[PDB]
Paper text:
The Rho-family GTPase Rac1 activates the WAVE regulatory complex (WRC) to drive Arp2/3 complex-mediated actin polymerization in many essential processes. The WASP-family member WAVE exists exclusively in a 400-kDa, hetero-pentameric assembly named the WAVE Regulatory Complex (WRC).
Firstly, we tethered Rac1 to the C-terminus of Sra1. Comparison between the WRCapo, WRCD-Rac1, and WRCAD-Rac1 structures clearly reveal that Rac1 binding to the A site, but not the D site, leads to WRC activation. Compared to WRCapo, WRCD-Rac1 does not show major structural differences (0.46 Å r.m.s.d. over the whole complexes). Importantly, the density for structural elements crucial to WRC activation, including the meander sequence and WCA, remains intact and virtually identical to WRCapo, suggesting that D site Rac1 binding does not directly promote WRC activation. By contrast, in WRCAD-Rac1, the density for the W and C helices and part of the meander region were not observed in the reconstructed map, suggesting that upon Rac1 binding to the A site, these sequences were destabilized and released from the WRC. Consistent with these observations, the pyrene-actin polymerization assay showed both WRCapo and WRCD-Rac1 were autoinhibited and could be activated by the addition of free Rac1 (blue curves), whereas WRCAD-Rac1 was basally active (solid blue curve). The D site engages with Rac1 mainly through a largely hydrophobic surface of ~550 Å2 presented by a.a. 961-978 of Sra1, which contains a helix-turn-loop structure formed by the H11b1 helix and the loop between H11b1 and H11a helices. Among them, the side chains of Y967 on Sra1 and F37 on Rac1 undertake a dramatic rotation of ~80° and 110°, respectively, creating a tight π-π stacking between the two residues (curved arrows). In addition to the π-π stacking, the conformation of Rac1F37 is stabilized by a hydrophobic pocket formed by Rac1V36,L67,L70 and Sra1P963,I972,Y967,G971,F975.
Residue numbers in the entry:
A (entry chain E): 1 to 106
B (entry chain B): 822 to 981, 987 to 1121
C (entry chain C): 24 to 177, 499 to 518, 528 to 544
D (entry chain A): 5 to 27, 57 to 337, 341 to 367, 380 to 540, 542 to 574, 578 to 784
The structure:
Amino acid sequence: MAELQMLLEEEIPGGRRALFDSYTNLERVADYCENNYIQSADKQRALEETKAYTTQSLASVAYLINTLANNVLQMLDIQASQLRRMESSINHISQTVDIHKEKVAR
Amino acid sequence: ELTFNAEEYSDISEMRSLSELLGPYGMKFLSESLMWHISSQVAELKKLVVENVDVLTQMRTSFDKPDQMAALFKRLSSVDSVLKRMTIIGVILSFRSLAQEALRDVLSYHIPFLVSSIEDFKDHIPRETDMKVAMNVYELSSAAGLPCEIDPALVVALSSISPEEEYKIACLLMVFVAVSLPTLASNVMSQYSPAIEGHCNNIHCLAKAINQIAAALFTIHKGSIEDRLKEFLALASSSLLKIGQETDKTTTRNRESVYLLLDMIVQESPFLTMDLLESCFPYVLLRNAYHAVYK
Amino acid sequence: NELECVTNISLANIIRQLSSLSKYAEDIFGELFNEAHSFSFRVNSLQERVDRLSVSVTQLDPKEEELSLQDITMRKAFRSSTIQDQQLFDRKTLPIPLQETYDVCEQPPPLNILTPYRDDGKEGLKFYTNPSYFFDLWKEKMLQDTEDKRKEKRSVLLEAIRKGIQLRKVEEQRENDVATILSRRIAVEYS
Amino acid sequence: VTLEDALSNVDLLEELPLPDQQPARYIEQATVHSSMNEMLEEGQEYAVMLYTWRSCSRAIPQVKCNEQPNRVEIYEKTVEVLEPEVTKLMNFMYFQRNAIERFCGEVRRLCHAERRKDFVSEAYLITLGKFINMFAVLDELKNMKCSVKNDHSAYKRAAQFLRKMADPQSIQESQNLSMFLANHNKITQSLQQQLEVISGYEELLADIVNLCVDYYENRMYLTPSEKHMLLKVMGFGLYLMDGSVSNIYKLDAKKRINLSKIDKYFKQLQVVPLFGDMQIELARYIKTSAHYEENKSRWTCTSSPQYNICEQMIQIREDHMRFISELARYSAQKTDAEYRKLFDLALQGLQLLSQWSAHVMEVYSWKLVHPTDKYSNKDCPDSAEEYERATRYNYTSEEKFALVEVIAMIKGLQVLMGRMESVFNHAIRHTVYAALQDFSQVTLREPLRQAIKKKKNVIQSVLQAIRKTVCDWETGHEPFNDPALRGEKDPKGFDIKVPRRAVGPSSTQLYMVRTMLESLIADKSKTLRSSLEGPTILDIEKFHRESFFYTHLINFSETLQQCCDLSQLWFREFFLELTMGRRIQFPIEMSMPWILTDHILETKEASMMEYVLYSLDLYNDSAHYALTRFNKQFLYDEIEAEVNLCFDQFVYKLADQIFAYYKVMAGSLLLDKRLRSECKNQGATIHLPPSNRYETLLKQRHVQLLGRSIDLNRLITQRVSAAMYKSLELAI
């Protein structure tokens, strides 16, 4: 049960903060690459640099999405299992209650 | 006109009275006799399965090449006998299900404590446990009429050729049945009737027949039911979709009615989900067929 | 090279699209986290309730049970919750991305600054667009139809049960909900 | 940090379990074309602005006497509220004047005597047709909108009282705008008057109309919008031809234009949606022609059947099944055959979706333009608005069911095609690249050799330009051992390896190549066609006619979404203006999706029960159209307000009927069979309850509406629980 709170209040907010940071940095990097291409003597260097930047950012975004998605799936699984466990205890309680009622009737 | 009406003997009220008169012992005896009949049917089916092993073996590996499958399907012999036997098995299983639900309803108010205890025990039994204790749990549950996923009586009957060879025959049975599904489209009796919610030749019980037979066979042989049922679904979907392109009225008289067989199979099968059907069979075709069979 | 300038612009646009995808993922993940966190609160609360109920139930005593024939109907009857969801398309339910898509769209003219100079005091903007027109006209039509439709259609335990029936008779049952309006029309078409 | 690592990450991300899904001189031409496109983007903006205009003078506190205490106090408010609204009218007037002047200048430029018999691209003619259609629709919007004049003149009384127009130029521009608005058919009249001054414009109109007719006859279009645009341009051009100087009937006798084809096309299809909820009657352009009175017998379209959609459902259904069956089987590198198969399958699906959308729009427009009456329809009451008879009582139950079925099929095919976005895009682009490279690197060789051999520099220059614009040399340069360049016949040979990669050519490159290639086949052009053999020209025409849809298919998503546009089924600005303040907005029972859903629910049709949800996303489509194209907040607000009650009514009725059907089935199940048989024998049969498919709706948890996910199952559960409690209490 402890891992539920951990995955709730230490993983998902981390992924969110990370994704917002990614959006801001990505806008900054598009502006930077555009600037490098027209105030650089070697255009091909900026193009390769630009290509490298575009390749990188995509990998980072994919990794963050994968991790976040995995965490969400695990959280759902943990919750469903706990709910199922609760459903068993509640059924036992109901069985005890109606057994007591039948005993009182007898 | 027969001398009796089946609706006056198979109705819920009549089934409930029969269950009340008989009891769990009588219901178990009836189920055992039905499983004996189903085992005889399966043994007869195995002869047809084995007598066409060569074509079936190549069929399984060529599902993606219709050119050779078209010629291969022409070499199969007795393609309607298998369908008839599966329909008989499905009818027997449907009768068993009616009896079991009647017994469950009867016992639901006669011994509520024992029924509740059995339901609680079966529901919260870890499936990771070996089949040795799961079979006993399922037998105990079915003694009260519970809807167990795997029928212990069917397993016992079908349990009663090397071990590896019996598994290959079981696997090839599903492939043989799948490719014979489109042959029903040419039958005039395969017309779906909304008033009946099923076909006139009882081919709608083929879903239950296939599911129960596959479950019993692949739990007896320590096989994987999910994987085998997924193979059956892929082969059946491909065979049916090839029919959709054809324009001959005689061969496609009840193609739309036959298309609903996949939907029924997925609905009543506890191992298959709509996601698998959609990945290999769009639901729009089933929706269109449902629209057409109503008018 | 003009072609080289084009490719750089395309790469910048691709980075911008990557940021847009980042925001399309972030909003969904935040909404999912919020709803799952609320679900976790509910689960924890009901777990506390369940353990309390179990520890209470494991103390019952059949001999302690006492049945009062007189209090059988003098007792308040238990009723389960009957909450029904309605108004599922309100402004509060608008997703954020639609919020940005909408707040950037052209706003209606400031006709609301003319209300003080109107003799009847009716809202000026309501002469331009009236979203509540659907609801008010439909309600008026439904009420009129219903009004026409009615015309178209046209021992000590003994003391306890007596008190119960008296309470039930006197304590009978006691609108801008569509479901209520429809229930009225069908009930009126009946007697 | 590498491309391979990023691709791997994407594959890894995709590998997750996600269950429970559902229950030269051509440069000048290019520049002019670009300018025309830019002008068109502005014309569309002005048209949409005009369409979504609402009377702003109604809310004004109209003054009855001339001595009101606050008479002077409201004029400033009126001025400050209507200044931007009149600025838009001034901008529209300036834009339309500039557009008319530019179109007249281009017509004069292309109508010169020496330039008359030169070569002009078909795209330019299509653009001129688009311009004339834009002018016609703008004139129609100006004529229909009677509130713009009132608002402008109220602002006129507001400004003149305050004496803020003392500037002479302000008075002049105000008078110009007032007279522009007062006149009827002012835009068309001005353009026409400016047309006669040019001599020979009839020839340009004629070849434009001929190009449009040829395109329509050969089905040279993909989206229904283009299909309607062709007919609209034909009609408007025919209207423009007839006048003081030019006569179509005399021109027709010269065989310059064909009137029989246009007449037949108008007879088969009579009405198309001009803009928004307004439809254009094609025969009006002929009936209003200058010389139509003395030649009415020539036209059968004007005098007066086939719009019944209930009789065309068999072909629709059969086609749908055949296509869905073909596509289902296509759910490491493959041969060109598979890519070509995917390309043709995508083209066929897009064409089928466009055909269905065109049929639906045509039937809707015809019904709108032909309202019924109590004499024809008995259900229609004596008192009813124009929209009532036009829509609500103008559809039969079978017609509504057919429309719902067609819409559901369209949306199902759309989603199925979208599921295969990547495969279709890859196959289409690979096929396009392979075809372009193979053509430009092999097919042009023989022609080039012939040209060099016979000293045809004119052909050689354009052929070399074509081969230099697109051809990609795997070796990094054009081969030097090629015998075609030297002009001597190749040995026996000279195998050349054409590279293969999946990318479509840029729009500029494709347009440039097409313009060069269809210049060689031009009959008008001394004709260049006369300098080429037969097989080469035949192959060139084959390639040119095949490459028409490359641009549309490259933007596969946009084309697919365009071919399935159904947002025009909700807007009612035209009919609202036709009320003149009586109706601020039509009630719930007038929006076609609501009528369809309510009819399906009330009739309790088992077959159509599964289409109730498919007939509900028209609201989402209309909201998207308003928020993306119209960009009007109030339209979305009204759509949301309507949906808020539509969904509630639908949910309540669905739950009630589901509970009733289930209770009836349960009661029938327990009824004694012998009693039923005895009653049937005696003549008192107890009718059984018809079956239904409510289970599909019960298993629905993803109903999407305006970005909201609604759990229909929860609401149905609550309603059935309440009904069960009420039934138990009633029994007790």
